[PDB]
Design an enzyme around this catalytic site. Sequence first.
Site, PDB file in Angstrom:
ATOM      1  CG  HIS A  52       2.297  27.378  -8.440  1.00 50.81           C
ATOM      2  ND1 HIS A  52       3.002  27.620  -7.480  1.00 50.81           N
ATOM      3  CD2 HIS A  52       3.323  26.174  -8.939  1.00 50.81           C
ATOM      4  CE1 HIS A  52       4.319  26.626  -6.487  1.00 50.81           C
ATOM      5  NE2 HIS A  52       4.121  25.997  -8.014  1.00 50.81           N
ATOM      6  CG  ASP A  97       1.928  31.021  -6.120  1.00 46.70           C
ATOM      7  OD1 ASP A  97       0.853  29.959  -6.747  1.00 46.70           O
ATOM      8  OD2 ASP A  97       2.410  29.972  -5.811  1.00 46.70           O
ATOM      9  N   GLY A 186       6.321  18.636  -5.858  1.00 44.27           N
ATOM     10  CA  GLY A 186       5.245  17.871  -4.977  1.00 44.27           C
ATOM     11  C   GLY A 186       5.389  18.636  -3.950  1.00 44.27           C
ATOM     12  CB  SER A 188       3.739  23.352  -4.637  1.00 47.10           C
ATOM     13  OG  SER A 188       5.150  24.235  -5.459  1.00 47.10           O
ATOM     14  N   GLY A 189       2.313  24.657  -2.655  1.00 46.10           N
ATOM     15  CA  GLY A 189       0.830  24.727  -1.444  1.00 46.10           C
ATOM     16  C   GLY A 189       1.398  24.101  -0.865  1.00 46.10           C
TER      17      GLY A 189
END
Lengths: 238, 58
Positions: A52, A97, A186, A188-189
Amino acid sequence: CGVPAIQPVLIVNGEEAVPGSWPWQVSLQDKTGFHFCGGSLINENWVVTAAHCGVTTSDVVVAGEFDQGSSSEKIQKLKIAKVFKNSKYNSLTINNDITLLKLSTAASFSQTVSAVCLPSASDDFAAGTTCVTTGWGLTRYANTPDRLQQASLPLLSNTNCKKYWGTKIKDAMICAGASGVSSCMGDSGGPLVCKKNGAWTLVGIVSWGSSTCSTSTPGVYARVTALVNWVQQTLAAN
Amino acid sequence: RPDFCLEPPYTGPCVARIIRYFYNAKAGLCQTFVYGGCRAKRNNFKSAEDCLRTCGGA
């Protein structure tokens, strides 16, 4: 992999990390240097992050960073050659994801830049296990903190997670938290790591959760064990 | 203009920090906001131009 040259000492309600103690943590930024997501180095030529985050080849991978507010700090701004989004990512349910980024020029591993270990598809990390998540996401639900943050939190069983999120929890998701900390804009990932025989291993990838970054609700992550076969196959073919 | 242009910006449940544009009917222009990365509503554009062409004047 999974062994920091600089040992760590242990996101809303998290704490400042020891400079360079999470060497696989990278910052994904646009061409101007704007941080929009985190990521994890899995080797010198590949970074794993969330699908995402929408990374493109115009974005850049910044490794070896601690203080984003420091212009002096020495870092590595790596260009992205190709983006590998898992074709199974469901933009509706948010399942599967995960995205892999292949670097144009390899990263120069060092004391503050190295890889995190990947788990085996069969690994079993029990609920209650104390893991850690890191990132430059908001510390309060607002600008991002300059210095890398960290937080220790417990993995939750699927049954316990569903008591809150119900059927929104899919097979490629794993929950952690609801313990006083929370991932936020901020983050995410970024990584959710737990020790496997002493080495930090990527168990989750920050994905989604409370719309208000609540610390009493379960945070949801992409379940790396359910996705690592896809990761290995992608590497071998590229 | 479509009524979705009158909805406030929606960050969504994902936790990224992606700059997007939404039309602010009160001000009459498109402004930036932080999008989480998933489940975007329609008043969410990748560029200010797209936003003005779709919602301008709402």
